[PDB]
Amino acid sequence: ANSTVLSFCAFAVDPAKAYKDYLASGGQPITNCVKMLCTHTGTGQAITVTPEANMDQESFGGASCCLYCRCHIDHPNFCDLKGKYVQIPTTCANDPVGFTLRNTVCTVCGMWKGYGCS
């Protein structure tokens, strides 16, 4: 499952673009990301030092949601997810890996642009 898609991305000259193209081909999103059993009364910001999911999110272990960490390859950012917790809207939690790649954290409020920001 994941090994097939991850192997495909790991050796592509652009891993993120390969995952994107893969998904656009109807590919199955990477699974096995780890979720936190949290309060859901957090700030709701995107990437935090402790789980911060609010009622509309899930909190995942950062490294388990990072394409480069999962492909065991060098990062192009080292890694701003590893060791942190990533808050993902529940309606998008079916693809934690793809969500951080496709979205942007607001430099001002710390929340995902389009899902919490302003």
- What's the number of CA atoms in the CB half-sphere (13 Å) around residue 43? 14
Task: Draw the binding track, 59-78, toward its own copies (x: CB under 8 A; -: no contact).
Answer: --x-xx-----xxxxx-x--
Residues at the contact surface with Zn ion, assessed by CB under 5 A: 66, 68-69, 79, 81-82, 106, 108-109, 117-118
Distance CA 54, CA 45 (A): 9
CB of 64 to Zn ion, least distance (A): 9
Confirm or reject binding of residue 35 to its own copies (CB under 8 A). yes
Confirm or reject binding of residue 8 to its own copies (CB under 8 A). yes
Confirm or reject binding of residue 49 to its own copies (CB under 8 A). yes
Is 2 within 8 Å of 9 (Cβ atoms)? no
Which residue in 22, 66, 47, 39 sits closest to 109, CA to CA? Answer: 47
